[PDB]
């Protein structure tokens, strides 16, 4: 169960980074002063957002850009909680055994 939930989350995270990159540019163009407006740097912004690093070099200023950002965040965080929970499950079993 756990590994499949984790693997799926990883696949789902990759999809969210790419879709999030596309949707962030769509949301932010048309807002004066917005910088999250070209796709290559938007993919970079989605990665530093999903990992929760959040340098501050780029960020959304619109309502829809910010909603996209929160989905990226939660997708990243969730994937990591799942990988962590999966590692714990693995270890717990190998330790029962040892």
């Amino acid at each position, epitope marked *: 169960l756990h590994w499949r939930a984790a693997g799926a989350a990883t696949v789902l995270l990759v999809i969210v980074l790419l879709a999030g990159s*596309y949707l962030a*540019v*769509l949301a*932010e*163009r*048309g*807002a*004066p*002063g*917005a*910088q999250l*407006i*070209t*796709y*290559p740097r938007a993919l970079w912004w989605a990665c530093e957002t999903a990992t929760t690093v959040x340098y501050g070099d780029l960020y959304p200023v619109t309502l829809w850009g910010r909603l996209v950002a929160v989905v990226v965040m939660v997708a990243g965080i969730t994937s990591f909680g799942l990988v962590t929970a999966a590692l714990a499950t693995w270890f717990v079993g190998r330790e029962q055994e040892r």
Partner: antibody
Amino acid sequence: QVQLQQPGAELVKPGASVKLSCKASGYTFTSDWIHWVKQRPGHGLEWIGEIIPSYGRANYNEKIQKKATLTADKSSSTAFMQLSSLTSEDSAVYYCARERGDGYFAVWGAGTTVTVSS
Amino acid sequence: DILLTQSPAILSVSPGERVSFSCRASQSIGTDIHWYQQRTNGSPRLLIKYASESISGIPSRFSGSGSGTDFTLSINSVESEDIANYYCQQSNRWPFTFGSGTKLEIKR
């Protein structure tokens, strides 16, 4: 082959409207945006607006009076700019240009010379 | 919105000389500047992207430099075909904007 094809000219009476076209060929991606640029004789390049065909959303220059409405047809790979209620101030060459979502205009159409006159 | 100032508006050089066009942004825009050449009755043509990156098909004669607010387009050894108007354009913040253009004149 020519990536963006535009008609050479359009004559428009003051107050009437006209719909300019820009037919695209070559590689097309979901990240493409088509932009329109206005250039009056002897003057510089003025950005009018952009549209992303894959989604149909358009943004416009807020600094100028809005004369344009952008649309795009996916099946005919054609982008359109509807100019309305024109005056002589609208007489100029209007170019369409393609941007691959990375900020620069890789290719430009030949431009449509629009003359507003009776 | 970002203002791009191109000055002087007219540059006159002698054949074969190195010339440089200036583009100054009203605020720092990284290297998000692109340059276009527009010959008389022609449409604009991209020459350099992201301040210094080459474009295939463009003579090696052209190059770009700078970052922040000050950018330069240089032509090593100008020749007649370089006669044209040159424009810079930024893509750092929405909306994209263009400089007012510099015309290259050759003194033969």
